[PDB]
Amino acid sequence: PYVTISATEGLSAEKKKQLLERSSDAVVQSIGAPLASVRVMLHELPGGHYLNAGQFNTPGLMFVVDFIEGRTEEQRNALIAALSKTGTETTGIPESEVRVRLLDFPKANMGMAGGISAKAMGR
Amino acid sequence: PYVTISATEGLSAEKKKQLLERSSDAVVQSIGAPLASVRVMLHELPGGHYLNAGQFNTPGLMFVVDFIEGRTEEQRNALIAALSKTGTETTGIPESEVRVRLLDFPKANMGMAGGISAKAMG
Amino acid sequence: PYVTISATEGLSAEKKKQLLERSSDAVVQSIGAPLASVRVMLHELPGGHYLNAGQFNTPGLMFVVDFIEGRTEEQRNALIAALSKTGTETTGIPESEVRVRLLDFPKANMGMAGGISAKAMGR
């Protein structure tokens, strides 16, 4: 599971660490993914690089999760909710603004350690 | 709808401002999306971080749209055309080099305000 | 096709150069795509912006390939093989850590030169 986070700049180093750590925790508790398979990446949006509803310079925090298809609806809703709550508890940005997206991948398309697809592993 | 733009370094602040503003317009007018729901993000690619058909240091401008399933072909073709046109008008990079990608998300996978998906939102 | 590389900071200029050039070669050789169609983009992850299995400050190299639907499983496996191998040969990051993802696009979803889709071109 890949968690790619887009945040507007302004967070301290402490907040970044906490955001990524608790996001990883959120994935583990939501869909029961092993920690060894969880990765979080942070992309920071500089000033004027985020247009929100026609407004510049607004706080932003968006989650995108790349994962192998097959998760149940309950798992998806739990994942969206956990990451959204994590983001707000960490950054202070309300869930009304925080967004989370889920992207499905066929096992044949998800390469794994040693450079083979998840289907080849029969993951 | 999320519009994520990847552009090579070199643009002025004014053209950056122009790029995102008109990108927002392109979305509103192509698929009839409410302005309140339209977001545009910009990522700048430094020199040597963009390889174009074997060549480094060439101008780059690529659009990626993340949005919910259900749009007609006409809407989708219009969105691609409008973003391509917008990109050329604001940066000077010809539509021959400009690129637009679309991502369909099922309502079950697209989170909304309040940490709930579009499907659960009903 | 689009090859978007996410890599932790630390690579020299010449290694970044080889990585992009050989990732392009990997695409051309694996799926037989013309050189004129291959694009490679590099996103560099600063310190503390990549969490790997609960640990910060680890080397990271992740490939995401955005491309049109229709490629065979044979090509997909070969592409994942070529990029993973390229990633290690260039950066020195072992294939056990290197990751390659493949993302299918409907022909109507892939904009081409001139602001029309691949489907509109007749592909």
Residue numbers in the entry:
A (entry chain F), C (entry chain A): 1 to 123
B (entry chain C): 1 to 122
What did the publication describing this PDB structure actually write?
Here, we have described a global mapping of structure–function relationships among the members of the tautomerase superfamily (TSF)4 (3, 4). From a structural perspective, the functionally diverse members of the TSF share a small, structurally similar core domain that comprises a β-α-β motif. All biochemically characterized enzymes in the superfamily fall into five reaction types, each of which uses the N-terminal proline either as a general base or a general acid. The domain structure of the TSF is relatively simple, with nearly all of the members represented by either a single β-α-β structural motif or as fusion proteins composed of two of these subdomains.
The percent identity for each pair of sequences along the similarity path is 42% between 4-OT and the Fused 4-OT, 41% between Fused 4-OT and Linker 2, 26% between Linker 2 and Linker 1, 31% between Linker 1 and CgX, and 33% between CgX and cis-CaaD. Among the characterized fusion proteins of the TSF, only two enzymes showed substantial 4-OT activity, Fused 4-OT and Linker 2. Indeed, both Fused 4-OT and Linker 2 were shown to be proficient tautomerases with 2-HM, whereas Linker 1, cis-CaaD, and CgX showed no activity. Compared with 4-OT, Linker 2 exhibited only a 2-fold drop in kcat/Km, whereas Fused 4-OT showed a 23-fold drop in kcat/Km. Linker 2 shows a trace of cis-CaaD activity. There was a stepwise loss of this activity going from 4-OT and the 4-OT–like enzymes (Fused 4-OT and Linker 2) to Linker 1, CgX, and ultimately cis-CaaD. Especially interesting is that two of the key structural connections linking the 4-OT and cis-CaaD subgroups, Fused 4-OT and Linker 2, also exhibit multiple links to the MIF and MSAD subgroups as well as links between the cis-CaaD subgroup and the MIF and MSAD subgroups. We speculate that the central position of Fused 4-OT and Linker 2 in the structure similarity network offers a starting point for new studies aimed at addressing the evolution of the contemporary TSF subgroups from an ancient scaffold.
